[PDB]
Amino acid sequence: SYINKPGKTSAWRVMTVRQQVSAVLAYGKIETTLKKAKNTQKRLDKLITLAKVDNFNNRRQVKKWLLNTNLFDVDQLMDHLFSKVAPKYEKTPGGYSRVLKLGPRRGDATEMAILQLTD
Amino acid sequence: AVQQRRSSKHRRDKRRSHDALTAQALSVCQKCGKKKLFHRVCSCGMYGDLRVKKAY
Amino acid sequence: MRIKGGKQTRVRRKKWLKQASGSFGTRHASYKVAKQTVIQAAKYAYRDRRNKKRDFRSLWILRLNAALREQGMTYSVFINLLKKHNIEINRKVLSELAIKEPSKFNLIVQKVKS
Amino acid sequence: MIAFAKQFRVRISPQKARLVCQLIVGKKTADAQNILSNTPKKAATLIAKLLNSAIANATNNHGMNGDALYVFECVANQGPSMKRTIPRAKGSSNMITKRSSNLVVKLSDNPNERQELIKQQKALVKKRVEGQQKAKMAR
RNA sequence: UUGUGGUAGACGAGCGUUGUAUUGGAGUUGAAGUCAAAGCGUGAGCAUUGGUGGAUCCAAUACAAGUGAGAAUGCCGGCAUGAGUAACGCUUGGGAGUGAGAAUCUCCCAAACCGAUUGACUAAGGUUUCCUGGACCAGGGUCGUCCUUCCAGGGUUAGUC
RNA sequence: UUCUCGCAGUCAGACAGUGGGGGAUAAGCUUCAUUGUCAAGAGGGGAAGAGCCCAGAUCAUUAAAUAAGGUCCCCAAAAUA
RNA sequence: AGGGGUGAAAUUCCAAUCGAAAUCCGUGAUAGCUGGUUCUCGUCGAAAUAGCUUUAAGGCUAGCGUGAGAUCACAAAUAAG
RNA sequence: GCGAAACAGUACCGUGAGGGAAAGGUGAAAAGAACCCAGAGAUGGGAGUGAAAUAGAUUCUGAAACCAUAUGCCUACAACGUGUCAGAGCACAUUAAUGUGUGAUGGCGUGCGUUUUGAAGUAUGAGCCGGCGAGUUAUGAUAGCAAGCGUUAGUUAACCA
RNA sequence: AGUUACUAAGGGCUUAUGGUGGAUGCCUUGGCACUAAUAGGCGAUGAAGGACGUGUUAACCUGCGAUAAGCUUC
Ligand SMILES: [Mg+2]
Ligand SMILES: [Mg+2]
Ligand SMILES: [Mg+2]
Ligand SMILES: [Mg+2]
Ligand SMILES: [Mg+2]
Ligand SMILES: [Mg+2]
Ligand SMILES: [Mg+2]
Ligand SMILES: [Zn+2]
């Protein structure tokens, strides 16, 4: 066959990662597919760990990932992160998030999973 | 490529032997009673003694 | 005058199908196959109704040969010893059954020794 | 003591409904409602409702014990079909046939409930031979 | 006593169907038709009992024919198999809401293509497809609370176009 | 199997033995005369074979004697010299 | 506008069709050519050759089958001479 | 049977001339199934009317192919035109019969029409079931059989009542 | 060392049922072919055939024509 959708290009994967990390920091919970959740978790953890020092280099490095959401805009989301989310976790070595499996979806029988983060 | 001879009602039934379904594993959530499929969160939104969701 | 007649056709086909029961697969369902199989089965019946009397005589010969081979003579010599001497029309089966009730058969096989 | 419940012309296939109907058959009702809710099939949301309706019909109407119930016998018979045309290359117009299923679930109360159907079968031939014999008095 | 394999093919005797005629006769105490059964005939074919069904029908002798189906790449209808296989015909992520039910609907926020266009105005055509409210038999290549589908109500206003 | 009358069908034949033509004493070749068989014909022998050998099926029998062919086992039936 | 048209010519194009459109009618065209032709039992049982044929895949007559009837001894067969 | 038993030359195909279908039956009468339970709802299960609701709006009867369920028997070292002749074990019990259903195991076994010298055919037709479907008719000729009438026989046609 | 009941993922045979499906059977405000009578046309006084409209009544069918599911008279 010939004409075909662009599909899951690497840019699509990375941009989905960015959108989901923005969404999880903004609200604190995500209800997504499991096999996107296990892939979002890595970037989530790396950001929160990179964000405990608060120098301007860390602000630049985190600006490379976040996107604005309905709750917070990006320059509001950065402050919201570095003020309350990042320091809360400052003493935990790893393990900043959990992915728990929901029930299968009616549309596709995909394995819905919830991504969240608590102490 | 086509069949040369119709596959009877005997050969067809034999092929579908492996089509049977499996009964999925079931657990009973503590913190309420119900049969959630094992290793998930029931509709309580409680997984074990931890809360991960809303009422239903 | 118009005549339809779906009764007679169905009755005939029903008889043909009823003839072939205990047949594999569709042979007892579709009539077109049932008729072929009934015809073939009756051919086999006609052939076997002759082959079975062709074969049962052979079986009697075999189970008479075995009985005589444990007395010291063969079946191909026993038949002489019935026809030429002590002319007997004892049949070729009953001289077989007499072994299943033996020691009355030994009387035969030693009677022809005269 | 059967108390069945039937749904006609459900928009599911007969051959996809028979896969979960096999799961539910012969098992007790407590481990049927939930086991049928939890399976990921289209043929399960359409049979959970029907099975629960059968439960309610048995309990209210006929007045059986409940926790003695078990799913006696399950099927998905072929409901009426729908015929539709489908375009193709070069205009050849194959016919799509939409299927359907006349689901019915029977819920027995006593554990046997099967020798009784055989008993009716045997009576239906006993009376035939009896009527045959009473008509041998044609002298 | 002599015979009795047999296609093309000649000849003979016959069964069954539909109806008409006269003659007998059965029928809601259940007629035909339909299935089932462990019957009777040399064959075409013919009875008996029971369930269903709910009003016509059986035998005897003649008569008249749309009179006897396994084949026509036969006609019409139904149903299989191939098979729950190929295909599903250019695109995402989430929050909040609704609702019995949501990937699929409403809102929000991004995200991704278009940009001499997937934008805006109209002719030709098409003929209500437009707007509001409601519904989810069928159509939608999935789903659907939703649709350009369906239902009730509505809208097109010229001295100069 | 001669004569008259009604009614057809058939006119693509094949093989084995025999005597010859064409052929190359080649063809499961072709064309003839002749005897059979098959066609239109089953059973047994032939391992399996339409055409060879024996034979010519009214139907049933879980009866007896045979023809060709055959008797260590498959496969029924034999020994002596 | 079709035993016509048009063609910077290819047998192009003439409403997805063009060595002569589309549909209606004569019309159930004709076809020595394929295919099909529906219930049973009994009696008998062939030919696949000769002559002619614008005939050779077909046809007519003879030959061979069957039915009805006669000839019934001198007719036809089968053996010896 | 008119193409047409009903809103048929309709719907539909075609630019156009033109081509051109399918399907009917509750019960005597709606007494069209209030009410209850499950469910969102259709619907289903009880109730109720009624002779029957296996008459329920899928609406006279309701075969077959076809798809599912189940008692009884067999099958996972076995070469199979799928049956037949023998034959065990198993389970039942009849249109009372040297009975019925299955059938471990032995012997035996290359379908049906067509056309052909000859086809299991590596030649062709049929996917399966049901229905429809192919030597008639008018007017004359000859032959066979039967009947009436008969040795100056027999016999009417058109037409009229 | 050896003998042999049980297994059936699934299949096969019979028998009973259920569903689809609508043949056979009964029936019909319909057609077919005919007989006996009658009559053998309509139309500038605007026909045949059609559109459009009309309701206490949605659409459709029918009747009917601004006098519009009807008017006058015997
Ligand atoms: Mg082939
Ligand atoms: Mg599979
Ligand atoms: Mg495949
Ligand atoms: Mg594949
Ligand atoms: Mg695929
Ligand atoms: Mg035939
Ligand atoms: Mg071919
Ligand atoms: Zn719980």
Curated annotation (Swiss-Prot), chain A:
The gene is rplQ. This is Large ribosomal subunit protein bL17. One of its GO terms (cellular component) is cytosolic large ribosomal subunit. The keyword Glycosyltransferase does not apply. GO terms for molecular function: structural constituent of ribosome. Belongs to the bacterial ribosomal protein bL17 family. PROSITE patterns: RIBOSOMAL_L17. InterPro entries: Ribosomal_bL17, Ribosomal_bL17_CS, Ribosomal_bL17_sf. The keyword Repeat does not apply. Part of the 50S ribosomal subunit. Contacts protein L32. HAMAP family: Ribosomal_bL17 (MF_01368). NCBIfam families: L17.
From Swiss-Prot, chain B:
GO terms for biological process: translation. The keyword Glycoprotein does not apply. Residues 6-17 have a biased composition (Basic residues). InterPro entries: Ribosomal_bL32, Ribosomal_bL32_bact, Ribosomal_zn-bd. One of its GO terms (molecular function) is structural constituent of ribosome. Keywords: Ribonucleoprotein, Ribosomal protein. It comes from the Bacteria. GO terms for cellular component: large ribosomal subunit. The keyword NAD does not apply. Residues 1-20 are annotated as: Disordered. Pfam families: Ribosomal_L32p (PF01783). Belongs to the bacterial ribosomal protein bL32 family. PANTHER family: 50S RIBOSOMAL PROTEIN L32, LARGE RIBOSOMAL SUBUNIT PROTEIN BL32. This is Large ribosomal subunit protein bL32. It comes from Mycoplasma pneumoniae (strain ATCC 29342 / M129 / Subtype 1) (Mycoplasmoides pneumoniae). The gene is rpmF.
Curated annotation (Swiss-Prot), chain C:
Disulfide bonds: none annotated. It comes from the Bacteria. One of its GO terms (molecular function) is rRNA binding. GO terms for biological process: ribosomal large subunit assembly; translation. The keyword rRNA-binding applies. The keyword Zinc does not apply. Keywords: Ribonucleoprotein, Ribosomal protein, RNA-binding, rRNA-binding. It holds the Pfam family Ribosomal_L20. InterPro entries: Ribosomal_bL20, RIBOSOMAL_L20_CS, Ribosomal_protein_bL20_C. GO terms for cellular component: ribonucleoprotein complex; ribosome. Binds directly to 23S ribosomal RNA and is necessary for the in vitro assembly process of the 50S ribosomal subunit. It is not involved in the protein synthesizing functions of that subunit. Belongs to the bacterial ribosomal protein bL20 family. This is Large ribosomal subunit protein bL20. It comes from Mycoplasma pneumoniae (strain ATCC 29342 / M129 / Subtype 1) (Mycoplasmoides pneumoniae). The gene is rplT.
Swiss-Prot record, chain D:
SUPFAM superfamilies: Ribosomal protein L22. The keyword Transcription regulation does not apply. GO terms for cellular component: cytosolic large ribosomal subunit. It holds the Pfam family Ribosomal_L22. Keywords: Antibiotic resistance, Ribonucleoprotein, Ribosomal protein, RNA-binding, rRNA-binding. GO terms for biological process: response to antibiotic; translation. InterPro entries: Ribosomal_uL22, Ribosomal_uL22_bac/chlpt-type, Ribosomal_uL22_bac/org-type, Ribosomal_uL22_CS, Ribosomal_uL22_sf. The keyword Lipoprotein does not apply. Signal peptide: none annotated. This protein binds specifically to 23S rRNA; its binding is stimulated by other ribosomal proteins, e.g. L4, L17, and L20. It is important during the early stages of 50S assembly. It makes multiple contacts with different domains of the 23S rRNA in the assembled 50S subunit and ribosome. Part of the 50S ribosomal subunit. Belongs to the universal ribosomal protein uL22 family. This is Large ribosomal subunit protein uL22. It comes from Mycoplasma pneumoniae (strain ATCC 29342 / M129 / Subtype 1) (Mycoplasmoides pneumoniae).
